[PDB]
Write an enzyme that holds these catalytic residues in place. Structure first.
Site, PDB file in Angstrom:
ATOM      1  N   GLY A 100       0.809  -1.201   0.000  1.00 15.80           N
ATOM      2  CA  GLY A 100       0.000   0.000   0.000  1.00 15.80           C
ATOM      3  C   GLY A 100       0.844   1.253   0.000  1.00 15.80           C
ATOM      4  N   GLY A 148       0.812   5.225   1.359  1.00 23.43           N
ATOM      5  CA  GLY A 148       0.166   5.979   2.417  1.00 23.43           C
ATOM      6  C   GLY A 148       0.487   7.458   2.405  1.00 23.43           C
ATOM      7  CG  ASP A 193      -8.668   7.929  13.985  1.00 22.10           C
ATOM      8  OD1 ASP A 193      -9.911   8.076  13.963  1.00 22.10           O
ATOM      9  OD2 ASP A 193      -7.972   7.844  12.950  1.00 22.10           O
TER      10      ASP A 193
END
Ligand SMILES: O=C(Nc1ccc(Oc2ccncc2)cc1)c1ccnc(N2CCOCC2)c1
EC number: 2.7.11.24
Length: 340
Positions: free
Chosen positions: A31, A33, A149
């Site tokens: 991935g 980011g 979060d």
């Protein structure tokens, strides 16, 4: 004087240049980011699959360097089954002039809860996953670290549903899993902000649907209150936001719940646990340690696995204001000083 340290090789990964030590082979894109990118690799020493994070221009500003430094210290400090941790840290640099970036090596996690969400979920699976969440939260909390979060996208899992918490110590972004007191800042928050998040995530596993949404903070609040019911005088008094307090006292005072009715398929124990995590009063809301004692986890509970950090996370430079160059000096030393 060199271009990079011996035993390093240059290789393109996802159309970007990576500089990896010999011991890590077959790098594979995972991935891209906000501040770096990730690949997987085989540690030929053990044949185990790791994830390698390349930091992207960490030294372009004091803000980037601190953040990059913070991630390194937190990953290094936490030692827990259900909290992502550090296997290794390296840099191809051979000096400070060379120092442009570094790599974090971590255990590889196949996927995350956000990607496997929606698919019904048996209560046994829920019991197992949530139990792991709570254990990781108990650990970071005991180190004085709150996630703030937590979300399914932050809960990594492998194929055996082993779980590790990610990204701890972090217009209109989505805030579905965020604690009301954080979104409305209507009283001061404690570590149980993460427990609210667990409640939202557990509820979503039970029903297949996100619990709380809304275009704006007020609509989200209206959705939250449909579930918690309008809070009574005891709670109202704790509010430090008189305008919000007023607004709450001026609502159709709709009594709380029957979580048995809101979640008509949930077991009594599951509904009961939900009731105690989805609690507006931040002083009555369950801590991680307390939620771990709940009957919902009886089949999986092992007090021995429910460890605490021995030492609080202690970054003396957390507040410091330094020059990018000085930051690189510290990050550089930490990398040198590290040992696998
Ligand atoms: O989990 C973390 N990092 C991380 C997570 C997953 C990842 O990618 C993986 C890891 C394992 N398997 C697959 C992908 C790479 C880094 C992590 C922990 C604590 N603090 C973090 N930060 C706070 C400061 O600024 C942002 C970074 C990041």
């Amino acid at each position: 004087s060199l271009i990079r340290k011996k035993g390093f090789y240059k290789q393109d990964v996802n159309k970007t240049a990576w500089e990896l030590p010999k011991t890590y082979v077959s790098p594979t894109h995972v991935g891209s980011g906000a501040y770096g990118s990730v690949c997987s690799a085989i540690d030929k020493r053990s044949g185990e699959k790791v994830a390698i994070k390349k930091l992207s221009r960490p030294f372009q500003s004091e803000i980037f360097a601190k953040r990059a430094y913070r991630e390194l210290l937190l990953l290094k400090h936490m030692q827990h089954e259900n909290v992502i941790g550090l296997l290794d840290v390296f840099t191809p640099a051979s000096s400070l002039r060379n120092f442009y970036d570094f790599y974090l090596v971590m255990p590889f996690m196949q996927t995350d809860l956000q990607k496997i969400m929606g698919m019904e979920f048996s209560e046994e699976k829920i019991q197992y996953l949530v139990y792991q969440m709570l254990k990781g939260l108990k650990y970071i909390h005991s180190a004085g670290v709150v996630h703030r979060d937590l979300k399914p996208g932050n809960l990594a899992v492998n194929e055996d549903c082993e779980l590790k918490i990610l990204d701890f110590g972090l217009y209109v972004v989505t805030r579905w899993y965020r604690a009301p007191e954080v979104i409305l800042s209507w009283m001061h928050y404690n570590q149980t902000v993460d427990i609210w998040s667990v409640g939202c995530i557990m509820a979503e596993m039970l029903t297949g649907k996100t619990l709380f949404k809304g275009k704006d903070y007020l609509d989200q609040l209206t959705q939250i209150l449909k579930v918690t019911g309008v809070p009574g005088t005891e709670f109202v008094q704790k509010l430090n936001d008189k305008a919000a307090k007023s607004y709450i006292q001026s609502l159709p005072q709709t009594p709380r719940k029957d979580f048995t009715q809101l979640f008509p398929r949930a077991s009594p124990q599951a509904a009961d646990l939900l009731e105690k995590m989805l609690e507006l009063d931040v002083d009555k809301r369950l801590t991680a340690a307390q939620a771990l004692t709940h009957p919902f986890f009886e089949p999986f509970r092992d007090p021995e696995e429910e460890t605490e950090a021995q030492q609080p996370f202690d970054d003396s430079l957390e507040h410091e204001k330094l020059t990018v160059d000085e930051w690189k000096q510290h990050i550089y030393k930490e990398i040198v000083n590290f040992s696998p």
